[PDB]
């Protein structure tokens, strides 16, 4: 609670996870046009261009609401004035405003991650699958996303057990485990199973998407989510959190007891296992038979894992 | 790139003769499942015409062209041939060659499934 060195190291990797992921996604877009690939290399620079306004425009919410130039003034003068505070806190309440300004650093950045870690992964995974091998710029975002989803989600697991100690248990190395790897496998059985259904429609998935949005939408109201000020802010924020909602469920304002999350994970493995039995059942002559063995089996078995840590997780701590 | 592809045999030819073409990919091919051909002429996007299976070589065609490409592969040389017989004005156009490694998709005639490509060789027809 007092901003040690140990968490120090956590807050300094988010650059060299961040500042690697932007660099990442601006070299690899230029490459895709460099290659002609300009349906990709746009697509994949949109995500940043709004990722990084999607943050903003809750940063320019948060610092006014906290207090041309200032519309340049996002997450990059905010990560300065920690890490200015943080080399003297290395030197030697000001760790009451170190903690406290860190921690809403890092839901943000959160929100910055699964709206470009996730969604941004299946255009990359999307144009490895249908090429083959793919090349080592394309493997370099998969690798750090995979790690930006990695880091982002464990730190916002350190949050809560320091925001609140109603989750004493929490503490100990295997609650970290367990957790990110609840998230890196039911995401990539979900992201695998979107992806083998959109070679076949790119409109019905795409449709698919909207269905999901609005229920998540919707699913903001009747839980009457508030976390900003400005009418505006508000119409926002439920609509970036209910987009998160169609790749993973997070627990919305905390105060559930368990039984959201079985409703949306019962239809999630009788929707996803309902879509390879349309395959199996229904064979399709586009897909290679030869490689979609492995992929049919490594969909059903990481979702098998996931389910399996939640029952270690919630079973033992929760 | 790790092997180079190279084509050969464009030309000039009346309408309606014949005309050869030969494709040689120089370096490692053991990971290459397809390989094929493709016509682009100004004013048109890249349309797949003919590929190949390199493992088993069921030869894979296009409704426009089906029953008149002759798409033959040859190990000796580590290359493909290409046949016409009874040209037609619209098959003015570049021809390119590109592999492919194994993937997912089988469905070797979609422009963006092709990894790598080559330089392409002008053809016309009289
Ligand atoms: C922030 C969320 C944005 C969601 C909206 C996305 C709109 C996509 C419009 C595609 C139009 C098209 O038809 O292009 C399909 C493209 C290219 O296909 P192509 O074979 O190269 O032919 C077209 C070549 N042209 C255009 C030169 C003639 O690839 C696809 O199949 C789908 C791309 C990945 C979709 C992943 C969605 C994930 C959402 C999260």
């Given at each position: 609670m007092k901003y040690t060195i140990c968490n120090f190291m956590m807050s300094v990797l988010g650059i060299i996870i961040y500042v690697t992921d932007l660099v990442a996604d601006i070299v690899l877009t230029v490459r895709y046009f460099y290659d002609g690939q300009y349906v990709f290399g746009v697509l994949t620079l949109s995500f940043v261009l709004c990722g990084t306004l999607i943050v903003h425009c809750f940063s320019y919410s948060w610092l006014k609401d906290d207090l041309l130039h200032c519309l340049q003034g996002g997450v990059f003068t905010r990560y300065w004035f920690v890490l200015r505070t943080g080399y003297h806190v290395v030197f030697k309440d000001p760790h009451k405003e170190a903690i406290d300004m860190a921690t809403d650093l890092s839901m943000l950045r959160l929100f910055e991650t699964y709206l470009e870690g996730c969604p941004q992964l299946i255009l990359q995974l999307y144009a490895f699958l249908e090429r083959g091998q793919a090349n080592f710029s394309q493997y370099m975002v998969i690798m750090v996303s995979c790690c930006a989803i990695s880091w982002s989600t464990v730190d916002y697991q350190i949050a809560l057990r320091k925001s609140?100690?109603?989750?004493?248990?929490?503490?100990?190395?295997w609650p970290k485990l367990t957790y990110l790897f609840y998230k890196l496998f039911t995401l990539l059985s979900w992201m695998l199973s979107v992806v083998l259904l959109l070679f076949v429609d790119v409109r019905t998935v795409l449709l698919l998407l909207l269905f999901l949005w609005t229920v998540g939408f919707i699913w903001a109201f009747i839980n009457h989510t508030?976390?900003?000020?400005?009418l505006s802010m508000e119409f926002l924020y439920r609509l970036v959190v209910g987009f998160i909602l169609v790749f993973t469920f997070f627990n919305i304002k905390?105060?559930?007891?368990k039984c959201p999350m079985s409703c949306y994970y019962t239809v999630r493995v009788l929707g996803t296992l309902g879509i390879l039995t349309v395959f199996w059942i229904?064979?399709?002559?586009?897909?290679?038979?030869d490689y979609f063995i492995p992929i049919s089996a490594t969909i059903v078995l990481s979702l098998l894992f996931g389910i399996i840590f939640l029952g270690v997780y919630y079973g033992t701590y929760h | 790139s790790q092997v180079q592809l190279v084509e050969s045999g464009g030309g000039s030819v009346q309408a309606g003769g014949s005309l050869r073409l030969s494709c040689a990919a120089s370096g490692?091919?053991?990971?290459?499942?397809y390989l094929g051909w493709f016509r682009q002429a100004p004013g048109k996007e890249r349309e797949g015409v003919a590929a190949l299976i390199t493992?088993?070589?069921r030869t894979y065609y296009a409704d426009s062209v089906k029953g008149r490409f002759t798409v033959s592969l040859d190990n000796a040389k580590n290359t493909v041939y290409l046949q016409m017989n009874s040209?037609?004005?619209?098959?003015?156009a570049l021809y390119y060659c590109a592999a492919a490694y194994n993937?997912?998709?089988?469905?070797?005639?979609?422009?963006?499934?092709?990894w790598y490509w080559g330089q392409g060789t002008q053809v016309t027809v009289s």
């Amino acid at each position: 609670m007092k901003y040690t060195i140990c968490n120090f190291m956590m807050s300094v990797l988010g650059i060299i996870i961040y500042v690697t992921d932007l660099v990442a996604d601006i070299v690899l877009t230029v490459r895709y046009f460099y290659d002609g690939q300009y349906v990709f290399g746009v697509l994949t620079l949109s995500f940043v261009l709004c990722g990084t306004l999607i943050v903003h425009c809750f940063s320019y919410s948060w610092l006014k609401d906290d207090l041309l130039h200032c519309l340049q003034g996002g997450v990059f003068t905010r990560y300065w004035f920690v890490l200015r505070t943080g080399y003297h806190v290395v030197f030697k309440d000001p760790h009451k405003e170190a903690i406290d300004m860190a921690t809403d650093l890092s839901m943000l950045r959160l929100f910055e991650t699964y709206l470009e870690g996730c969604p941004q992964l299946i255009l990359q995974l999307y144009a490895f699958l249908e090429r083959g091998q793919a090349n080592f710029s394309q493997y370099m975002v998969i690798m750090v996303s995979c790690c930006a989803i990695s880091w982002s989600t464990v730190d916002y697991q350190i949050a809560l057990r320091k925001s609140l100690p109603d989750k004493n248990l929490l503490r100990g190395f295997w609650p970290k485990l367990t957790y990110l790897f609840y998230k890196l496998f039911t995401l990539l059985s979900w992201m695998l199973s979107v992806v083998l259904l959109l070679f076949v429609d790119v409109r019905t998935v795409l449709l698919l998407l909207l269905f999901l949005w609005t229920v998540g939408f919707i699913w903001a109201f009747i839980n009457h989510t508030q976390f900003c000020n400005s009418l505006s802010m508000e119409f926002l924020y439920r609509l970036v959190v209910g987009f998160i909602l169609v790749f993973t469920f997070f627990n919305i304002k905390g105060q559930n007891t368990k039984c959201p999350m079985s409703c949306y994970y019962t239809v999630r493995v009788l929707g996803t296992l309902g879509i390879l039995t349309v395959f199996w059942i229904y064979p399709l002559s586009i897909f290679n038979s030869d490689y979609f063995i492995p992929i049919s089996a490594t969909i059903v078995l990481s979702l098998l894992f996931g389910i399996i840590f939640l029952g270690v997780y919630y079973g033992t701590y929760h | 790139s790790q092997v180079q592809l190279v084509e050969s045999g464009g030309g000039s030819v009346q309408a309606g003769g014949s005309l050869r073409l030969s494709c040689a990919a120089s370096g490692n091919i053991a990971d290459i499942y397809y390989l094929g051909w493709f016509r682009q002429a100004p004013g048109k996007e890249r349309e797949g015409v003919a590929a190949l299976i390199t493992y088993n070589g069921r030869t894979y065609y296009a409704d426009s062209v089906k029953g008149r490409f002759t798409v033959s592969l040859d190990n000796a040389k580590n290359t493909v041939y290409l046949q016409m017989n009874s040209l037609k004005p619209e098959d003015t156009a570049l021809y390119y060659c590109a592999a492919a490694y194994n993937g997912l998709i089988a469905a070797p005639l979609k422009v963006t499934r092709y990894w790598y490509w080559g330089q392409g060789t002008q053809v016309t027809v009289s």
